[PDB]
Design a protein around this ligand. Structure first.
Ligand SMILES: O=c1[nH]c(=O)n([C@H]2C[C@H](O)[C@@H](COP(=O)(O)O)O2)cc1CO
Ligand SMILES: O=c1[nH]c(=O)n([C@H]2C[C@H](O)[C@@H](COP(=O)(O)O)O2)cc1CO
Lengths: 129, 129
């Protein structure tokens, strides 16, 4: 019925980019249904729901600037499902993207884009149009 | 020829637990060959080598206290390979383990152990003997 875009960003890793994430999610809605956590014993259900969303998504979009086990885990499951993946990283003095994420990239099905906050809407438009 | 144990810990996520990791690795050597990064354009090879180590390991051991994309990614690939997994977490004021890692646990093939530094050698002995 509609293209599904899975979005993932850090939560327990840190909520420093929480405002940037809502900007990304709101842009993504222009291109399809966005499947993403709504962030304010429960962990198993959280794992289940994100795994199902990732599996049925047509594109996986990850903001990978803040280090996060959960985001890395979701990317690992996404790769093993051979998902189309877009990773968004903001270079910063003292912050280097994991070699496991940068090294997973191939420039087509798994893309890593270095960007800064001001251009994120333009980047998303360019990737999705 | 020998049982292989894959060990993963944060690097670009942060090297705060680097001394704890060497203690874990040195204990793991008692139980088999330890496949792990030796930490002091290169990312693709790093990704390749860890992915091959994880795939041929008989147990995957991850220290998941420090949030890390790479460790999460390795756990995601390990789960999709249906690896036997042992995750080690140290609870701390203000630090909560990712729901994606805690929620992935099943108490048998994927185990999450909460522990503190003083007992890590005893824990490893108990899991591996
Ligand atoms: O409460 C939550 N709800 C949720 O959906 N997640 C999923 C989605 C996030 O993209 C990702 C964040 O992982 P982490 O919490 O380790 O930073 O894991 C993670 C948490 C907290 O771990
Ligand atoms: O230089 C490296 N060598 C290496 O083997 N890795 C692998 C193994 C680590 O267990 C894991 C750490 O990931 P991260 O760097 O995102 O914290 O990724 C990661 C890096 C740096 O990303």
């Amino acid at each position: 019925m509609r293209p599904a875009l899975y979005f993932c960003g850090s939560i327990r890793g840190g909520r420093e980019d929480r405002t940037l994430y809502e900007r990304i999610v709101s842009r993504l809605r222009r291109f399809g249904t966005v499947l993403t956590e709504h962030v304010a014993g429960g962990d198993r259900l959280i794992h289940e729901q994100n795994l199902e969303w990732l599996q049925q998504a047509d594109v996986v979009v990850a903001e990978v600037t803040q280090p996060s086990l959960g985001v890395g885990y979701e990317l690992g499951r996404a790769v093993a499902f051979n998902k189309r993946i877009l990773c968004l990283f903001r270079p910063q003095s003292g912050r280097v993207l994991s070699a496991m994420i940068r090294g997973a990239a191939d420039g087509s099905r798994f893309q890593v884009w270095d960007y800064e906050e001001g251009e994120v809407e333009a980047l998303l438009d360019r990737y999705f149009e």
